[PDB]
Every structure is written in structure tokens, then in C-alpha cells.
Amino acid sequence: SNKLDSKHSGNYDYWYRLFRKSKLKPFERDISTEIYQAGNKPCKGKGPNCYFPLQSYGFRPTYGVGHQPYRVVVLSFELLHAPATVCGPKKSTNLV
Amino acid sequence: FNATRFASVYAWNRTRISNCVADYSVLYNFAPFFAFKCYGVSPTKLND
Ligand SMILES: *[C@@H]1O[C@H](CO)[C@@H](O)[C@H](O)[C@H]1NC(C)=O
Numbered sequence: 001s002n003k004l005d006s007k008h009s010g011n012y013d014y015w016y017r018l019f020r021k022s023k024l025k026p027f028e029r030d031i032s033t034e035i036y037q038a039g040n041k042p043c044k045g046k047g048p049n050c051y052f053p054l055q056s057y058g059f060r061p062t063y064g065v066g067h068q069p070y071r072v073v074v075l076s077f078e079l080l081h082a083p084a085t086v087c088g089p090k091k092s093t094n095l096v
Numbered sequence: 097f098n099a100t101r102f103a104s105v106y107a108w109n110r111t112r113i114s115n116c117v118a119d120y121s122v123l124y125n126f127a128p129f130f131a132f133k134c135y136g137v138s139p140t141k142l143n144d
């Protein structure tokens with residue numbers, strides 16, 4: 001998707017995180033703006049040894065393929081022998 | 097870290113470090129960092 005996340009003069013709307021205290025658990029979110037601590041300084045701000053946790057995912061219409069604005073959606077199911085709320089096209093016959 | 101005549105960027109003085117145990121606290125205590133970004137390894141995970 002290079003037509004919806006790109007425009008002339010660029011677009012730095014998107015975001016992504018590189019600095020977090022620990023790993024991310026599966027299917028657990030961590031939306032927060034807390035400056036990563038480097039060492040023992042309690043610095044709350046940007047610049048020296050106290051960095052913003054998240055950086056720009058800036059996108060422009062002219063990048064490389066590995067740098068293009070790829071749109072990704074994941075689908076997750078929990079299939080087993082159980083009742084269902086999602087099905088497929090199939091008519092129901094009569095009981096014998 | 098504790099050099100006094102760091103070579104300019106046109107030379108990019110590189111040193112070979114071998115046959116020692118890399119403790120990163122001695123690296124930390126000398127420099128009040130302004131950019132400690134990492135790419136291949138985690139800044140928290142360097143002593144293991
Ligand atoms: C609550 O738990 C869910 C599921 O693990 C997680 O995605 C979410 O981020 C948690 N709440 C907050 C505010 O972090």
C-alpha cells in the first residue's frame with residue numbers, strides 16, 4: 001500500500017517502538033510514552049541517555065521495496081471441536 | 097573510551113578488543129551518553 005500511506009513532501013504520521021523495559025507478551029499491548037532509562041539516571045525528557053521509547057515510521061512514495069509502506073492484517077482463530085459463531089457457506093439438509 | 101586524541105572521522109580509528117571479559121559498567125561510568133542506540137543486540141542484554 002504505497003498510495004494511502006504516502007504523499008508529496010512525506011508523511012511521518014505512523015509510529016513504532018524500539019525502547020522498552022522488557023519483552024512484549026503475546027497478544028498484549030504496551031501503548032505508553034515513557035522515556036527509556038539508560039543506567040541509573042531518572043531523566044524524563046529527550047536527548048542525552050534518556051530517549052523517547054518510540055520513533056517515527058516516516059513514509060514517502062519513493063523508497064525501496066524493503067522500505068515500502070506494507071499493510072499487514074493478521075487473522076487469529078481458536079479452532080477445536082466446539083460450538084461456532086463463524087461458519088462457511090453450506091446448506092443444512094434434513095435429519096434421518 | 098578514555099582517550100584524549102580520538103582520531104577524526106576521516107580515519108575512524110578502530111581498535112581490536114580480544115582476550116578479555118567485556119564488562120559494560122566500565123563503559124557506562126565513563127561517558128554520560130547522548131546516543132546509545134543499538135541494532136543487533138539489546139542495550140540491556142550485553143553482559144550475558
Ligand atoms: C490488558 O491485557 C490485554 C491482554 O493481555 C493487553 O493487550 C492490554 O494492553 C492490557 N492493558 C493495558 C492497559 O496495557
Ligand SMILES: *[C@@H]1O[C@H](CO)[C@@H](O)[C@H](O)[C@H]1NC(C)=O
Pocket residue numbers: 097098126127
Ligand atoms: C579518564 O581517567 C581519568 C583517570 O582515571 C579519570 O579522572 C577521568 O574521569 C576518566 N574520564 C573518562 C571520560 O573516562
